[PDB]
Design a protein around this ligand. Sequence first.
Ligand SMILES: OC[C@H]1O[C@H](O)[C@H](O)[C@@H](O)[C@@H]1O
Ligand SMILES: OC[C@H]1O[C@H](O)[C@H](O)[C@@H](O)[C@@H]1O
Ligand SMILES: [Ca+2]
Ligand SMILES: [Ca+2]
Lengths: 682, 678
Amino acid sequence: SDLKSPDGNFLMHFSLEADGTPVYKLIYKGKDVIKASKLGFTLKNDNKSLLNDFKIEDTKTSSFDENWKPVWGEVSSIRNNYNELAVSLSQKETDRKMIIRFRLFDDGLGFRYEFPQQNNLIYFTIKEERTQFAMAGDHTAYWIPGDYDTQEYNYSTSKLSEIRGLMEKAYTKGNASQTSFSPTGVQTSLMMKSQDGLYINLHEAALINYSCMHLNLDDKNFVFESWLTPDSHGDKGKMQAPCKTPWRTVIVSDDARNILASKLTYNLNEPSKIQETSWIKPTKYVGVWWEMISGKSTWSYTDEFPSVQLGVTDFSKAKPNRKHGATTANVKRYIDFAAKNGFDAVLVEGWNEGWEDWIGHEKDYVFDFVTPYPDFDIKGLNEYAHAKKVKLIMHHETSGAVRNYERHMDAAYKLMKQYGYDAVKSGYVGNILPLGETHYSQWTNNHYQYAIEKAADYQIMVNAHEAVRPTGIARTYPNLIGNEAARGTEYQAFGNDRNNANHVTILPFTRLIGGPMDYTPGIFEMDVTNGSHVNATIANQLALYVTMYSPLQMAADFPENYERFADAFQFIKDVAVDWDDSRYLEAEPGQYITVARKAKGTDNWFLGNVNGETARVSNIDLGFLEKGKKYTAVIYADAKDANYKTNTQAYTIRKVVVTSNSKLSQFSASGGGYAISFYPVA
Amino acid sequence: SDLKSPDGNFLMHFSLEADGTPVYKLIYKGKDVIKASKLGFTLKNDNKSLLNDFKIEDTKTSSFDENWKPVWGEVSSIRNNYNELAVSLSQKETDRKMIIRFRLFDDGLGFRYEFPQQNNLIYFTIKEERTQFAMAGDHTAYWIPGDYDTQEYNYSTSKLSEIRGLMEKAYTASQTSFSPTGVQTSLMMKSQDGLYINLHEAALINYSCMHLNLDDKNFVFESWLTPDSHGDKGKMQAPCKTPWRTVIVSDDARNILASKLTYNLNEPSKIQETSWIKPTKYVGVWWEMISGKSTWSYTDEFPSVQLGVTDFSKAKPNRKHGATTANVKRYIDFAAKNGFDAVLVEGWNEGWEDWIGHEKDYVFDFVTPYPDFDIKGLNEYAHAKKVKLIMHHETSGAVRNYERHMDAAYKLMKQYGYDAVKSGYVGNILPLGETHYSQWTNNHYQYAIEKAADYQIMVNAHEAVRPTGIARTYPNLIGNEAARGTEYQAFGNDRNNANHVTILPFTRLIGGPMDYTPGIFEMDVTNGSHVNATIANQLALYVTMYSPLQMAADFPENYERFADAFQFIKDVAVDWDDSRYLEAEPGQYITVARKAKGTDNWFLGNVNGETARVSNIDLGFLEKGKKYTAVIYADAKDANYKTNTQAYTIRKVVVTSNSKLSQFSASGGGYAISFYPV
Ligand SMILES: OC[C@H]1O[C@H](O)[C@H](O)[C@@H](O)[C@@H]1O
Ligand SMILES: OC[C@H]1O[C@H](O)[C@H](O)[C@@H](O)[C@@H]1O
Ligand SMILES: [Ca+2]
Ligand SMILES: [Ca+2]
């Protein structure tokens, strides 16, 4: 009945109500974090469902404590240490079996349901999951609207009781694809902060063969309930026993830093299924990208036609619109910039026929993922890159046409291998075809998984924009080196409200739980070609290489902008992308994050701070340094009058020798931050 | 504005109503066959649509007369001869362009719509096509219920005015009807004054399958296309065009069956080298399962199976399994002994335990044999006897699952020397809400055929959309079922009406051959169902149900028992330099003689409906001044599809082009004749 974390700080009580409803409760340092919360499912075409009338048939406890080494990560080694309670239930009248498995870590709780092979539950359909998380009160939440098709929203900070009233404002419209569901519906990872100072995160782990979980708030009693994503037919999981749900996670601490530090989500995913992983490479890149995003260049080659039909349109005879970004000459310039500056790769978007019709047409045969435009020399460019020790990153926008991508996928991945591409950035902009499907159903989640597994067979890394938000599956498939799956830097170029200045102080407490984000930091020119204003300072942009953890790190700006601020650019050149250790020094969701990281295979550290709406002086504890050593520190900081709105390019650079006993104090501006390199003195 | 067939028997008048609605009319030998009929479309999210307010902006006429050689067919050479009127319309207010292209042949009319590249119509969605066929009167029709998911119905013969009343009875895994007066195409009719009229379509590509909805007050049919999973009836992008709509008409029913208009309206072959495409006579491990004797499944030990998890090597064999090495070898031996090309095997691969009723995604992998099926040995044994196996790919409606496995499956075929596959789509197309005949699913069938062609594989697709002549363009599509086949003779209920095979050639076969699986000699099968035919009927089907792919569906035992009758099945060819329909009346009888390709040999079959009848035929198709040995395989005088199915006679006689034959055919009976030069 009762389960504890290994350190004893968590207690989880499992019971049955009089009517056989399974309920759990969670206590942290003697305080309620999850009050009495019901568990189970409403099934389609089933009067009784799996909501009640259970009896406990068996319970089993055990303990686990091992370490494992990630391929890439924030630390060289991760501890997986929990106590487990497995409750075997049996329903009266139907005699159907459901197991509820709980794991309690020093970071909090994971639980899932399991259906063993049995006689009276075989094929079934989940109409709604009925998993609750009853809150102790009217917490502050850091939240985005519940949506079946996009996560690309600015966060709101409010009380639970205020979500309803804010929902209309927070639910910004005119995304390529978006579908809300409730006036009090929110996505996960959801971050909260109680009245009395607990940090509480609700999420899930190992989202496989199952629909993405959102949460619906009952704002009278402060109870969240699992709200899964409907497929094209309205169903919320076509199941076959033996089978099991993803884990539901409640990560909790009285120290916000421990939320960020937690590996609980990854610990609840299966160990790596990739045996030899040396082909998987953390990457720093530039690309022909922001040019199109910020309105200077096009993905398209020609404007001559009302629409294009691949295999019918003859691109070699079309009039070039002369705006195309992905020309041989332009791609060479980025390759030269990358090779000069120690970057691993160059993304190119708009390389392939079809871009004329990429957005908003609900077009099936939109791309073939193989045919270059006439002005992009695929063979020449990949030879030139390889001779300078650089690779191109393949881009496979699907524009929502999932079958079309599946049918081209093997030829596309083979083209990659033929030219020495080893990573692909995929996308899913637009409604999923055929219309009525959603981005995060069981069905579409299966496609993202299938793309990842097939890529693994080719030794290809995947970075998937507009896919379902991650849930720790990179442990199992470390070739998943990124997703977007949240509001990235691209929105800083899309006008409207761009990104809130404190955006990057929330993403780590929400979106980053489950896996890294391809955020595309490093903007130095904030007033871009199409008039949009990037809401950040240069030093904020440098800090992101540490504060937005990822094995895949873009420097998104143009070569000429980096040339203009070459001194600041040094930090982007110096910073690592993979780490033997990470130490969160300060963190408060929506306000600030400060973190230092030790570059893998070295004694070097890199630190960043990102700061929200309120300018703030931080006092930096340098005790993470090694004792007895002196380090050359270079501090890239906001000038005292820097500001994300009106003074974005004002920064200072200074060098100072420090030890583990040195204290540092630094002003960060509004939407600002700072970055620091530390190299031992020789 | 006016168009005529090359022979002058057809006149087609195109006009616009006062309000700009485009209308057509068709006249055959001075008699109205299509009265004034509207054309155009209702578009989704479009107030004006494409119904009216057109003006004729241009017209263009031309003529075409060429011959082409089919890879396989009823004749060695086919004439494509038509006059064309292309009417270029322009809508007021919108300025949108729509071309209506008409081709008028001696056999009747084809027309389609085309949208040229234009600035004010690019991406659009068809909510309903509004193509009409206004009838001259209350014709007799030979029809099946309109359905988005199956065509596996018995035909009904009735007046147009009686369809409504009969529809409850005619609508008796996956089926969805749509109207009390909805019917499928090809739809066959006969007017009270004796005209035979067929409505159908050709070149169903990148478009939704057309049904017809009858207004039974004014006798007007109107295109009713198949909705996709989102309810839509065509996601279109200009430049684009519809399939052709066809009105095949003659005062002689035999000309309907002879017509090649359907194929003539499809693009010429896109397969350059075609010698790998081989008309095929086959047997198979098949009827055993369909007639309740054997299973597709290997084990009954488990409530359900999960491929890659269930260990079939350790499961208890149910021993009912049809597709064992030993059983397959029996059929291989039988085929090689009897000069058959191939053996179909169903149930060879893991997953059959859950094939039906579960709406299961990962249902098959199309590659993993059961433990009792030695794939390598069996294909070597077959090839050593100069026989091939035919691959079976039931998808159970899980289309994405088939698409994902399709390259590896086609490679496995190539690896073991399979060159033909029988595919299936039993059950609801996944995800639920999709239909079998939507634009979306039709795309998949086409994709499977074009991909097969890249691998030099032939396709025979059960439960696919019914054909529309696409085999001219992709002649590796050597069959579909896509209608009620012989399997229904084993499923109890009403089985197949005795006159079924006298209607299919006037309906289903327009557009492409059917894998009907004839040749049943034992009509009272293991599960108690009664096949409604005589033996001589079954022999005639090798000629009267035209197909490059011909099964002898019964068990080897049963053929051995009636070895004398079996000789016809062994002798008959499967590809033809000429065909002559000698007698034909829909729902009553069909008699046809075909000249085996490359030879001076002929084969004739008659099939006969509910009413016993004496057939009286002239053998003047034979070459003049030569003598032939004829063997006539016929019903005994007391044969009967219900109570005396195995009573047949065999008689030999020398004939010439001046010989006449008179031959009794029983109820649900028929006769078959071989003709070899002296
Ligand atoms: O593929 C075109 C674009 O699609 C999406 O908004 C991606 O997030 C973006 O990074 C990419 O450039
Ligand atoms: O694949 C299983 C069965 O499916 C369908 O009913 C077919 O038409 C039949 O020939 C086949 O045996
Ligand atoms: Ca995006
Ligand atoms: Ca069938």
